[PDB]
Each structure stands twice: as structure tokens, then as C-alpha cells.
Automatic annotation (TrEMBL), chains B, D:
<comment type="similarity">
    <text>Belongs to the cation transport ATPase (P-type) (TC 3.A.3) family. Type IIIA subfamily.</text>
</comment>
<protein>
    <submittedName>
        <fullName>Plasma membrane H+ ATPase</fullName>
    </submittedName>
</protein>
<feature type="modified residue" description="Phosphothreonine">
    <location>
        <position position="4"/>
    </location>
</feature>
Length: 230, 5, 230, 5
């Protein structure tokens, strides 16, 4: 009853207990203990759910603290603004560290281990996602480079996806969903956003109608598309 | 904020 | 614009951001920085909400991990049981430390500072609550002493409450609610539980009908009372 | 589990 095996079981107890930081740790043990083989679909999804929950809690706090700093800076209340920004820096710091940890793991182990179109697009989309979270709060030269790394990763993901995966594939559909959110929200370019989202939705519709979760993601492209045409 | 997965 | 003042404001940003561990820290700064005066009703409630959220997350995980260990020990699956218990010990450890931190603060600063019947019952009920959380997972000689400390604190709280507070007072009503849960769940004595819960409910009903949140707690006594008569 | 406050 192996180390890999027991770490995966612990990661799943951590997921039930909602101790996501521990879940991340157990899955990195798994991931750093692999030779030439890659993570199973189950293991990869466990690592991804762990990081997503560790980063989402901080993104949720960052939005809250940021909406407050803006209301308060708008009433010209300077002492509260310093207190709020200092709180926000603390949070941005945890966001940089969390991203740094999954981005290093992607470049060092995951991406080099990706042997099929499914896993390649999965890890490249992930790489695009964490550089994008860095861009949501960064501001200058830092924002420009996070935005550039984002665009580069999504494009590499889309090249593979477009040619090796079905348009109804959830990973390809999720890539299109996140890539178009990037155009809309980081690049403030609503037109490239709508175009990319609609093309992916249509191609999926086309395939479903001729060749036969992909359902949930498509509802999400539609929800974003209408949200944006407003 | 838009939906992502 | 004072240290006490700024720590309270930070505690409230922490509450909005749901970073309860930090909320606890900011409120301990507040609490350890007081001379002969006590915490305001606002500050005391902020400290209490912070600890309640820090301990509740671990209690929620402990129940989950514990329900799993029991299902698995019941199928005689020994390797999973060791993994689950080791996970559970890690959680019990954080539960002991969290309790230890608020129990030390109660004995050293809060309780000695309590100058009115409202604050005394509030801190003594709290002391009863954290010894009770220790008892929910402890097992032997340890359980017996956590249970004894619990009973002693609630009784001291009830003496004061009974004689200095109105039966519709939410702190007195919350004390009765928690004290009766203690009889039911730690002392496995459903009859002392029902008696105490019903007496407090009736006294409140009596006062409301003659002298005029206390509403929510009373619904809770009733919900527990029916739950127990089943 | 019973309600407490």
C-alpha cells in the first residue's frame, strides 16, 4: 500500500474536510514523486481542485477588501484607506505565493510530463489561469508581463486543443470560456471576447447536432455572452 | 466577474 | 487615531474577508491592551465571532473525518482507518490549541475585567463552551476533566444569570440553550437536558406575556426540545 | 448535533 497511493487518499480526506492547503501539499507530494509517467485524470483533477480552492478564497477576500477600499477612497476617508490597502497587500502576497507554487510545478513537472492532447491543453490552460489571477491585481509593468504570459499560455493551449480535441470536449470548452474572459476582463476588449466565446459555442452546437458537463460549460459561455451584450 | 472553470 | 481603534477596524475587515484567524489576532491585541476597563459590547462580540469561526471550521472537519472513520472501521478496512485517524489527530491538535488560546485569555484578562452581570455570564458561558468543545472529542480521564470544567463554568454562569438577568435576555437564553446541549450530548442525560431547556423557555414565555434574537434563540430551544423527544 | 449559539 504505496506512498503515492496513500497521499492520494489523504488528499481526498483533506478535500472532504475542506482543508485545501493540505490537499495541495498531498497532491504535490504525488506530483513530485513521478518519474516519466504522468498524473492520472483523477490525480490531475484533485491537484487542480486543491489549488483552485486555495486561490479562490484569496480572490474572494481580495474582491471584498477592494470594493471597500474603493467606497472609502470615494468618501475621501484617508485613514481607512491606509488600513484597507495594508490589508489588501497582505492578501496580494498570499495570491503571489499561491500562483508561484503552481506555476513552478507546471514548468518543472507537469507540462514536461504531458503526453497527450488532453493533458497538454489541461496544464497549459492552467498556466494561463494562474498568470491571469496575477494580472487581476497587478498594476504596471507587472500587469503587462502577467498579461503577456497569460496570452502566450492560452494561445499555446488553443493551438493544441483546436487541432487535437473535439469542440464539445469540456477542457477545450473551458479553455475557450477562460480565454475569452481574459480578453474581456484583463485586456478590456469586449469584441475579441465575444468573438472567441461565440465561435467556440457555435462549433460545439454544430458537432452536437451532427456527431453527438460540456452542457454546463456551454451554458456558461452563453451566460457570459449575454452578460457582455449588456 | 464572469464565469470561468 | 489610536491602536485599539485601528485593531478593531482591521478585525472588521478580517471578518468581511473571512480571514478569521487574523480576526482573532487583532481582537487579542485589543483585549490584551486593556487596563482596568472591559471590552465594549461590540469588541466582545467581535472576539467571540472570531473564535467561533476559527473553532467551527475545525469542528465541521472533525465531524466529517470522524463519520468516515466510523464507516470504514465498520467495513473492517484497517489501512484506511489508520490514515483517517492520523488525519483526525492533526485536527484534534488544532482544536486543543484554539481552545487553549481563548480559555487562557478568559482566565487572565476577560473574566477578571467583567464588571456587570451581562459580561460575567457572557465570559463564563464562553468558558463553558470551549471546555465543551474539548469534551466532544476527548476520551478518557481527559474527557472527564473537560466535562467537569464545563459543568463548573456553566453553573457559575447560570447562578449569575438567573439572579441578575431577565429570562428573555439573549445571553441568559443562549446559556440555557448551550448548557442543556451539554447535558444531552456530553453527559448523555436527555432528561436533565429537557428539563433545563423547558424551564428556560417557559420563564421567557411567562415574562413576554406579562412584561414584554431572544425570538430566534427560543425557536432554537423548541427545535432542540422536539428533536430530543424523538 | 443540536443547535447552540
Amino acid at each position: 500500500p504505496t506512498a503515492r497511493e496513500e497521499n492520494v487518499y489523504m488528499a481526498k480526506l483533506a478535500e472532504q474536510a475542506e482543508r485545501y492547503e493540505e490537499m495541495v501539499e498531498f497532491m504535490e507530494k504525488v506530483s513530485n514523486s513521478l518519474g516519466s509517467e504522468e498524473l492520472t485524470v483523477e490525480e490531475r483533477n484533485l491537484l487542480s481542485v486543491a489549488y483552485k480552492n486555495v486561490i479562490g478564497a484569496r480572490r474572494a477576500s481580495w474582491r471584498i477588501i477592494s470594493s471597500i477600499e474603493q467606497k472609502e477612497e470615494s468618501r475621501g476617508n484617508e485613514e481607512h484607506v491606509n488600513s484597507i490597502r495594508e490589508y489588501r497587500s497582505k492578501i496580494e502576497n498570499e495570491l503571489s505565493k499561491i500562483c508561484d507554487g503552481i506555476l513552478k510545478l507546471l514548468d518543472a513537472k507537469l507540462i514536461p510530463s504531458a503526453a497527450s492532447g488532453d493533458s497538454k491543453v489541461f496544464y497549459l490552460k492552467m498556466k494561463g489561469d494562474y498568470h491571469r489571477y496575477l494580472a487581476e491585481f497587478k498594476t504596471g509593468a507587472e500587469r503587462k508581463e502577467a498579461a503577456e504570459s497569460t496570452l502566450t499560455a492560452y494561445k499555446a493551449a488553443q493551438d493544441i486543443a483546436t487541432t487535437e480535441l473535439a469542440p464539445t470536449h469540456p477542457i477545450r470548452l473551458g479553455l475557450a470560456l477562460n480565454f475569452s474572459v481574459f480578453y474581456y476582463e484583463i485586456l478590456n476588449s469586449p469584441d475579441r471576447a465575444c468573438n472567441l466565446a461565440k465561435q467556440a459555442f457555435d462549433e460545439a452546437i454544430a458537432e452536437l447536432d451532427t456527431l453527438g458537463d460540456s452542457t454546463l460549460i456551454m451554458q456558461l459561455l452563453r451566460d457570459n455572452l449575454t452578460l457582455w451584450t449588456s | 466577474q464572469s464565469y470561468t472553470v
